[PDB]
């Protein structure tokens, strides 16, 4: 009956009820999965959000820049799911880039310390989480990360585009490691969705250009997408992540699935 | 069932090893009601499809025959009932004359041979979509079979060119299908022992067929981080069923790789 | 001269706006000795090729005509003199019937029309390489013209499919050409005002031809970091001459984009 | 006469006479270019090596991680070429990755501080040099960087593959900035060449397998390449860089030219 019945899945990246990770968790629970959630920094606020999910799920703290949190993660997950049990899926829905690396801030003015922090959180941490969690994953398992197609340069995304290009490369090497465990590793390249990162990181960096730039982004995406695109609806993206967490894409690994309305395949 | 209540047309069954046979079997296991299409050997195809878990009507369809295409939607509507439409369409059809394959020199394939292969293998994806889109429901899905042609390779020769054209046709079919709320995608599969692999590819390789196919399988399984078994079409069938389902609703004009991850590695 | 001493065959001249006319002009300015091929209206084509800076023999070549292809190497050898070989070949040929283009419905193009377009626009790149590789020197270069078909777009319709096929053919021609020490590559150009743009692409757009080309050009120039001028074929002709030269000796089966960098960007 | 007659070009990345940058400089000088060279750390060795070039060229110190070197670079180059003169070309031929990020060292065991150093030198510095040098470049100018095709994961290249994926993305954004000055930015993806980085960095990280792994790489590359490939010959790569520095690829920017014998377009 449920697409993920009997599956134990770790979902990182919930910060608000608009987070892509919130919708992934909601859809996964609706489909029978038992979740373990991870949150960063504002744990009291995150628990208030995760209480809105269909079912209870333990929340563990994880700052991906914190070596101690990573070294303890597998043990804390095992305590949450019970000794002897393993995870079937892991969702990396994490990203960050300082303001200097985004929007109308000049591309050449982002200092390396800022870009490095963004690449650490947005790309290297996909390898860090796989390293910590592969030893407690079952064969047939699935690791999924979130991508924003960085094949071409574009306005505002700036250094986050470089971090996503690095993340696509990391995913191909993580697939080589995960294959030793019978585990798949893939990214879902989503179209634009109204989340806290889009408003607070992207929107805040666009300044007086946010209104026009985001309208043109939204309109162009919906126009290029042969089936349209609704930036207010994360459900099609959440369903796609759940398809990769399921047993229905068993031969796909080190790859990118586009949940973008088909926009990347069209010029206009 | 993943496809409960869905009405899906599946083309391309010729034997019980056909990729379409496994797609049809998995779709039926998942609750789909099928309409099947077959080319030329209707008596053999009926005997083969009697091995599927459930009954399904078999319609004749030669994609080079304009009359078959012009009458196809009406014949499908008769099989599924007036007022009912399809939710899914699977194109699992290919052909290339021997001159366009194997050890036969690339430059020696005459255009009449290449053209026949492009007609059946690439243009017909647009033909089947033209015939069936008027009888598809919104939220529907059209899926075609691909073999990654982004880089030249031994033996695949002109079939590589037909698949490159098929990928381009798929992106334009997605533009037309979107007007109906329908998705169009290809599944690029790794190598599977089928009649086309043995008769068409192996036939054109001559004395080197066994050795070249062994080298292809071993190399594919090595490159693929999760391995690859050419004797098992089930992972490819499951991937097609995922695209026919409501679980990839935002993917269109695209290519899903069901190849063990081989295309992403060296 | 970049091409001093080189003997190069250039197909595809029909008007003095043809991308092939500008490739031939820049190649002659750079010291190359040319052999030209033309289709159908050879008397008219000779009057156009008389506008080039230097004389060049003009040969008839309809790429759908097996007899023309079978005699081509002998006719080229007669034009350049026995004992000499070609260093370069330029394929700057394309055609698609109206049904396969513009506002005409993508599904209404009959296969006979699409097949004719694929024959002329893609298979012929393999035909010309088959006919001419036997009379090419090591270090030589075959160049074809492409229009980036990696993503679908309005109006280009079935010509996009033909260019996707041409890209795949080019990778296989590189395998054959490598046996002769010859490179094979395509140049994916941005939009240039030529007879095919006006008569074929524009012809199939009905009343929207002007609006569509102006919007295509504006968007292309905006997206291209160095800009794009659709009235100037010289940057494209120079790129083809770079591939015909000895300065890209390790590039084959590939695509070089002379499009202002538009394909690598979004606006 | 010369392909680069009258052009003033800065060339970074010479360490030995096998460096790709040494062959780029030699071919550029044979084609009439006037060079300014930059070197890192081993200036006494670099000066002796550059004395083997066909013509004299000033050598300037440049450590791309040193902010003071980058801030003074344009003034130092202007002093070398004369006030009132500007550069027509810039060649970035710089790369580094700590041993943990390469060879048989496990992908997951490379600490972020090591990956970050490698990404700083190998990818971010392409944007650093463009920021420093664009104010002193003429319209019609050209910036070229060196790439190794990272579109697919492969043995041994490990985190350097991630740095090159990031560099390709950086190049597309440097093209947007360089276009404001009428300057092109592109990468050359070269096949394998026996250089100090190949022997000391890649070979060093392969341990006891260095000889066999490099032999298989060379043999396979030459087999896949329709026109073949010679790892002992950097001249085809140097000529390709000179073609991009010339006026003969005037409409190509934010792009990647493959000087790899055509290997990337084939399977065998
Ligand atoms: N919203 C979009 O349009 C969109 C599109 C494509 C891809 N994505 C990607 O989806 C993912 C989720 O982003 P979102 O849009 O849902 O925004 P969001 O703000 O809801 O989520 C971003 C998450 O990253 C977490 N994070 C930041 N630093 C962290 C750290 N040190 N350790 C652990 N977690 C950390 C934040 O706490 C937050 O939960 C990101 O990878 C983003 O790049 C988003
Ligand atoms: N077998 C593989 O390794 C493999 C891998 C990737 C993709 N594919 C693709 O999968 C598809 C199915 O091939 P397969 O391997 O299952 O082989 P198969 O021989 O089982 O199927 C090929 C089918 O094409 C049909 N066909 C041929 N001419 C036709 C026509 N005129 N009208 C209608 N149908 C026609 C045949 O009747 C047959 O059913 C093809 O598109 C093939 O290129 C196969
Ligand atoms: N104009 C553009 O914007 C543009 C952009 C990118 C690529 N291209 C490509 O450049 C090439 C040249 O086109 P153009 O734009 O210069 O237009 P054009 O009309 O000047 O040239 C097209 C040429 O194809 C020739 N041709 C047609 N059928 C032929 C046949 N049977 N045999 C031999 N030659 C035949 C015509 O005679 C003509 O010389 C084509 O491949 C085209 O697709 C054009
Ligand atoms: N050798 C190959 O097979 C090959 C193939 C493709 C691409 N490449 C690329 O070509 C470029 C040149 O490498 P190579 O193979 O000639 O090796 P090399 O060892 O000759 O050159 C590497 C250079 O990087 C310089 N460098 C390192 N850290 C630096 C810093 N902090 N500041 C400034 N310069 C610094 C070194 O001083 C050296 O000159 C690199 O980007 C490399 O990745 C090499
Ligand atoms: O990327 C663009 N603008 C910025 C942008 C991207 N997005 C989507 C998104 C939101 C939040 C994300 O999460 C994050 C987390 C942490 C840190 C930074 C982002 C994220 O990864 C992606 N929303 N706004 C544009 C692209 C574009 C493409 C085609 C044509 C025109 C275009 O115009 C644009 O403005
Ligand atoms: O493609 C290759 N060889 C030929 C080949 C392809 N296949 C898979 C297949 C079977 C039948 C197919 O169906 C059809 C139907 C109708 C008409 C032609 C084929 C089909 O499309 C694809 N099996 N053998 C090779 C690729 C390769 C890649 C990497 C390294 C080495 C390689 O070596 C190869 O030999
Ligand atoms: O009208 C459009 N596209 C059609 C097109 C293509 N070209 C360039 C070209 C010319 C002649 C060619 O030569 C040939 C020769 C023989 C046979 C067909 C074409 C050729 O290959 C390519 N010019 N117009 C578009 C309108 C648009 C408006 C706004 C934003 C984006 C857009 O994108 C479009 O692509
Ligand atoms: O990448 C590979 N091995 C490692 C490798 C790469 N290269 C070429 C190179 C040398 C030095 C470089 O400069 C640098 C500078 C600073 C820091 C690291 C490297 C560089 O960027 C690239 N030589 N050995 C392989 C690729 C591969 C592809 C197809 C089939 C099999 C394969 O097997 C391989 O072993
Ligand atoms: Na749309
Ligand atoms: Na494997
Ligand atoms: Na569906
Ligand atoms: Na522009
Ligand atoms: Na070779």
PDB file of N, CA and C in Angstrom, chain B residues 148 150-154 223 262-266, chain D residues 149 151-155 263-268:
ATOM      1  N   UNK B 148      22.113   5.195 -24.151  1.00  0.00           N
ATOM      2  CA  UNK B 148      22.913   6.430 -24.113  1.00  0.00           C
ATOM      3  C   UNK B 148      23.825   6.641 -25.338  1.00  0.00           C
ATOM      4  N   UNK B 150      25.384   9.648 -26.165  1.00  0.00           N
ATOM      5  CA  UNK B 150      26.169  10.883 -26.036  1.00  0.00           C
ATOM      6  C   UNK B 150      27.610  10.762 -26.495  1.00  0.00           C
ATOM      7  N   UNK B 151      28.156   9.524 -26.534  1.00  0.00           N
ATOM      8  CA  UNK B 151      29.526   9.274 -26.992  1.00  0.00           C
ATOM      9  C   UNK B 151      29.522   8.138 -28.014  1.00  0.00           C
ATOM     10  N   UNK B 152      30.368   8.223 -29.062  1.00  0.00           N
ATOM     11  CA  UNK B 152      30.418   7.163 -30.081  1.00  0.00           C
ATOM     12  C   UNK B 152      30.980   5.895 -29.423  1.00  0.00           C
ATOM     13  N   UNK B 153      30.694   4.734 -30.012  1.00  0.00           N
ATOM     14  CA  UNK B 153      31.120   3.473 -29.399  1.00  0.00           C
ATOM     15  C   UNK B 153      31.156   2.393 -30.461  1.00  0.00           C
ATOM     16  N   UNK B 154      31.816   1.256 -30.183  1.00  0.00           N
ATOM     17  CA  UNK B 154      31.812   0.175 -31.177  1.00  0.00           C
ATOM     18  C   UNK B 154      30.404  -0.392 -31.397  1.00  0.00           C
ATOM     19  N   UNK B 223      31.901  -0.732 -14.387  1.00  0.00           N
ATOM     20  CA  UNK B 223      31.649   0.725 -14.321  1.00  0.00           C
ATOM     21  C   UNK B 223      30.521   1.065 -13.373  1.00  0.00           C
ATOM     22  N   UNK B 262      26.372   3.300 -14.672  1.00  0.00           N
ATOM     23  CA  UNK B 262      27.552   3.211 -15.542  1.00  0.00           C
ATOM     24  C   UNK B 262      27.877   4.503 -16.302  1.00  0.00           C
ATOM     25  N   UNK B 263      26.858   5.229 -16.783  1.00  0.00           N
ATOM     26  CA  UNK B 263      27.129   6.408 -17.587  1.00  0.00           C
ATOM     27  C   UNK B 263      27.811   7.542 -16.817  1.00  0.00           C
ATOM     28  N   UNK B 264      27.789   7.504 -15.485  1.00  0.00           N
ATOM     29  CA  UNK B 264      28.377   8.553 -14.651  1.00  0.00           C
ATOM     30  C   UNK B 264      29.807   8.260 -14.226  1.00  0.00           C
ATOM     31  N   UNK B 265      30.381   7.106 -14.693  1.00  0.00           N
ATOM     32  CA  UNK B 265      31.661   6.639 -14.248  1.00  0.00           C
ATOM     33  C   UNK B 265      32.603   6.281 -15.391  1.00  0.00           C
ATOM     34  N   UNK B 266      33.894   6.147 -14.974  1.00  0.00           N
ATOM     35  CA  UNK B 266      35.039   5.633 -15.732  1.00  0.00           C
ATOM     36  C   UNK B 266      35.834   4.659 -14.853  1.00  0.00           C
TER      37      UNK B 266
ATOM     38  N   UNK D 149      38.666  16.922 -17.669  1.00  0.00           N
ATOM     39  CA  UNK D 149      37.223  16.616 -17.742  1.00  0.00           C
ATOM     40  C   UNK D 149      36.662  15.908 -16.516  1.00  0.00           C
ATOM     41  N   UNK D 151      33.300  15.486 -15.797  1.00  0.00           N
ATOM     42  CA  UNK D 151      31.882  15.155 -15.954  1.00  0.00           C
ATOM     43  C   UNK D 151      31.487  13.793 -15.436  1.00  0.00           C
ATOM     44  N   UNK D 152      32.455  12.870 -15.290  1.00  0.00           N
ATOM     45  CA  UNK D 152      32.229  11.522 -14.765  1.00  0.00           C
ATOM     46  C   UNK D 152      33.299  11.178 -13.711  1.00  0.00           C
ATOM     47  N   UNK D 153      32.911  10.458 -12.635  1.00  0.00           N
ATOM     48  CA  UNK D 153      33.848  10.082 -11.577  1.00  0.00           C
ATOM     49  C   UNK D 153      34.838   9.079 -12.183  1.00  0.00           C
ATOM     50  N   UNK D 154      36.022   8.992 -11.604  1.00  0.00           N
ATOM     51  CA  UNK D 154      37.064   8.137 -12.151  1.00  0.00           C
ATOM     52  C   UNK D 154      38.024   7.777 -11.031  1.00  0.00           C
ATOM     53  N   UNK D 155      38.849   6.742 -11.248  1.00  0.00           N
ATOM     54  CA  UNK D 155      39.840   6.400 -10.228  1.00  0.00           C
ATOM     55  C   UNK D 155      40.850   7.525 -10.016  1.00  0.00           C
ATOM     56  N   UNK D 263      39.219  11.928 -26.970  1.00  0.00           N
ATOM     57  CA  UNK D 263      38.859  10.832 -26.056  1.00  0.00           C
ATOM     58  C   UNK D 263      37.522  11.021 -25.356  1.00  0.00           C
ATOM     59  N   UNK D 264      37.182  12.253 -24.949  1.00  0.00           N
ATOM     60  CA  UNK D 264      35.950  12.444 -24.183  1.00  0.00           C
ATOM     61  C   UNK D 264      34.668  12.172 -24.978  1.00  0.00           C
ATOM     62  N   UNK D 265      34.759  12.098 -26.313  1.00  0.00           N
ATOM     63  CA  UNK D 265      33.571  11.874 -27.147  1.00  0.00           C
ATOM     64  C   UNK D 265      33.366  10.396 -27.504  1.00  0.00           C
ATOM     65  N   UNK D 266      34.238   9.496 -26.979  1.00  0.00           N
ATOM     66  CA  UNK D 266      34.232   8.115 -27.362  1.00  0.00           C
ATOM     67  C   UNK D 266      34.242   7.171 -26.163  1.00  0.00           C
ATOM     68  N   UNK D 267      33.822   5.923 -26.446  1.00  0.00           N
ATOM     69  CA  UNK D 267      33.904   4.709 -25.611  1.00  0.00           C
ATOM     70  C   UNK D 267      34.595   3.598 -26.453  1.00  0.00           C
ATOM     71  N   UNK D 268      35.276   2.656 -25.785  1.00  0.00           N
ATOM     72  CA  UNK D 268      35.923   1.536 -26.475  1.00  0.00           C
ATOM     73  C   UNK D 268      35.799   0.278 -25.644  1.00  0.00           C
TER      74      UNK D 268
END
